[PDB]
Structure 1
């Protein structure tokens, strides 16, 4: 603090108290500004440890609502909150190095970083790795070039951009034209919730809004959901995966199951369906707008770090961890969320438990003699008899467009609820509101929802 560095402007610290220049509270490095890192930032003791954060993102992103912003069901301001307003809350003194990680130096015990606003290392006693993971193309060529991921706010802007501009170009031709019709097609690759949600929200849009001001388009508007697996939402059970789907078909969504994208050309994509009666067919879906909401694959730094640790030499999906959520082959390092290969699903839920646990599990390290200095790694935490991480699952949701939603709850293996009608939609909202972090976000979310109830959505390509 007060000095010159190699990270971007948003670099801040809070002066909440003051440090002893020559200091000893162990210093913890959080990687990321998302579901793990931020939740860990919530439950960590900011007094016993001082804490630095590295992510090139200075806000936090409430991903579950993400796909609903691109049609301006929600503004992108509503669903995000800047780290700071978290670290201001926090007790002791916290630092956001406003930049991205670049290499983990486990042996050299620092994390090397560069900013796209800048050979900088950074000190860490302990490392919390929560950078999460990017999406996977599966080298299906063209996706990168013509595709649209749906992972960060930019993408929400990027897609609205692309969609509208078609809608516009599309209007200036005749109904009889087919190019028009192609520009009005919309492929959403990936039939998990996000993609579904996306699809559905683009429907909720054509329908509820657009059709009013322009129905000649709205009629010709095509939305396709496309999924390798035999059903959408394979995380939900088969009963609802049928309803949800049938309902999407009711909303008018073309739902290509057991389909893979083989390649993405500019104006259409090559797709192969694999059939019940054994045979692979092919299709060709033409599109204006291609949202690629599928799968994941860990970042380079995470993977980079697989080499520089010996145990980590075969870590396929992400860093591998013990049941104290610690890197198998490090000690001072922990991986949570999506950069954390732990045989578990890679969701918000998972990551949130992962962080909470590890905060206590951390805080609860604060009264032990060995831990003041410095072999095998997990033997220390087995000894004092900490509890190892036990994932309490608690269901999964999905918006379906046109005001309905499947949903499921559980706690342990007791199913509280598992329905899927207007009732369930009207919960799903409440529910998500509940599971927000910040207030501002919540209320802003709430007002969007309200405003939409009494008026249209905001689909400006300007903004």
Structure 2
């Protein structure tokens, strides 16, 4: 016997959102809670502004500054929003329910607050009239041994804390060791795997901490740290014009970062890893790299609750990366479930930028559906001349450490800005600050950057 939550107080349809990230929150911001009853299931009680996560480990920004509680977005809604802090473990399409487990809390932001009768660590099924799936994707080790055990992903707030604690602990042991000790040099050694903007910014941020703050009180130690940027492709930041990639690499190397291109990690052990380089000519070299801190910033794979769903919907069996959706962001094989963000595959890159646009688009569709009597009761999309989702690539930005960035801003076929440099770094800051989804988070990031102009970064081992 499973507890089934199925709210039929009003005729408003029950919209059930999975997740509290870019897709789910952008959707929540735009959905009409006067026309729809909205519920959210996510094990993370806050929205995470991912593009600034790479600057959290070293305190360029603080962890709290870049997150925003779901409840704060929920308060600004006019209707009834319920937030289940729990994890969706099974999507059950044929009975229109989602199974949740690891239930920690339930928050009903409205008057009635009918007692639901759920208990922590007790399974349950939430019923829905529409499902919006946005659970994202999870880090992909690519089958490389040791990465889970010995490295750190850069995906969630706890990763920021773990990275800081590992590196801080390493600096402390290293400094006790005599200069010239290879163990000391290992402990001051950082490997970042992934040459996309995330890996690049992580390395640039760590290099900034070392050069700007650490060096103020432990210059010799700071001089010995070596940061390594490992990338499997022939260039870093390959979504950018090649000349910007070249600018970025030269700058990174100028800040003393070592870049290993055409290089892949073959295996990871506790104190060292094996890197193989596939040269242009075709030969393969390998290097054992001792490291103290390994940051794994690359690849993402479908979550288990999503790959399980693949098997329950015939049209979805051939899916591998994410849920196949139609022009309308409807999961194929379903007329009830929509998917947006990294958990959907529609040919688009996996970015917040795409997730945010899908969401705003879908929410607007939900405005139209609520004016068409048939949708409530009962192809409807084609018939009512809904327009397909159309992604508008607005561009890309990457911080490179030491107050330089690259950026390309566009819309449609028009490029409005494309280059790198000092001013580009100020643009990076302004643009990111303007993309943040909440006034509070925006103010906190702003205060963090102001403090940074006067004082060193907070780098507390365990705080």
TM-score interval for Structure 1 and Structure 2 normalised by the shorter chain: over 0.9
Cα RMSD (Å): 2.8
Q: Name the SS for the 2:38 alignment partner.
A: strand
Partner of 1:380: 380
**Aligned-residue offset at 1:372:** 2.2
How big is the shift at 1:117? Answer: 3.7
8 Å CA contact 2:5–2:127 kept in 1: the answer is no
Task: Find the residue that maps to 1:115 and give its secondary structure.
Answer: strand
Question: C-alpha distance in 1, partners of 2:214/2:3?
Answer: 49
For 2:103 and 2:4, locate their aligned partners in 1 and report how far apart those are by CA, in whole Å: 31
Q: Of 293, 308, 314, which residue of structure 1 is paired with 2:312?
A: 308
Q: Distance in 2 between matches of 1:364 and 1:163?
A: 52
- Structure 1 residues 362 and 429: alpha-carbon distance in aligned structure 2, compared to 1, 3 A threshold: same
Q: Which residue of 1 aligns with 2:273?
A: 269
1:255 to 259, 268, 271: 259
1:270/1:282 contact within 8 Å kept: yes
Report deviation, 1:314. Answer: 1.1
Unaligned 5+ runs, structure 2 = 106-122
Output one character per residue of 1:249-268: Cα deviation in whole Å (capped at 9) or x when no partner.
01110000110000001111
> Given the two structures, how large is their TM-score scaled by the length of structure 2?
0.94
In the alignment, is the contact (CA less than 8 A) between 2:16 and 2:130 conserved in 1?
Answer: yes
| Structure 2 residue matching 1:449: 3-state secondary structure | helix
1:93-145 superposed Cα distances (whole Å, 9 cap, x missing partner): 10101111000000011000101648411110000000000011001000000
Secondary structure, counterpart of 1:302 in structure 2: helix
Structure 1: stretches of 5+ with no match in the other structure: 1-13
CA contact (8 A) 2:89 2:305 kept: yes
8 Å contact kept, 2:4–2:126: no
- Residue 16 of structure 1: how far off its partner (Å): 26
Any idea what SS the aligned residue of 1:242 has?
A: helix
1:342 is displaced (CA, Å) by: 1.1
Shift of 1:369: 2.7
Query: Secondary structure of 2:276's match?
Result: strand
- Give the TM-score normalised by structure 1: 0.94
CA 344–399 in structure 1, closer or farther in 2 if over 3 Å, else same: same
**Offset from partner CA, 1:278-298 (integer Å, 9 cap, x none):** 211111111000000011001
SS in structure 2 opposite 1:223?
strand
Asked whether the equivalents of residues 17 and 93 of structure 1 are also in contact (C-alpha less than 8 Å), the reply is: no
Decide whether the 8 Å contact of 2:5 with 2:124 is kept in 1.
Answer: no
Contact 1:16–1:93 (8 Å) recurs in 2:
no
Counterpart residue number, 1:149: 153
3-state SS, counterpart of residue 28 of structure 1: strand
Q: Contact 1:60 / 1:81 at 8 angstroms: preserved in 2?
A: yes
Deviation string 1:191-234 (CA, Å, 9 cap, x unpaired) is 10001000000001100110011011111101000010111111
Contact residue 16 and residue 92 of structure 1 kept, 8 A: no
What secondary structure does 2:7 align onto?
coil
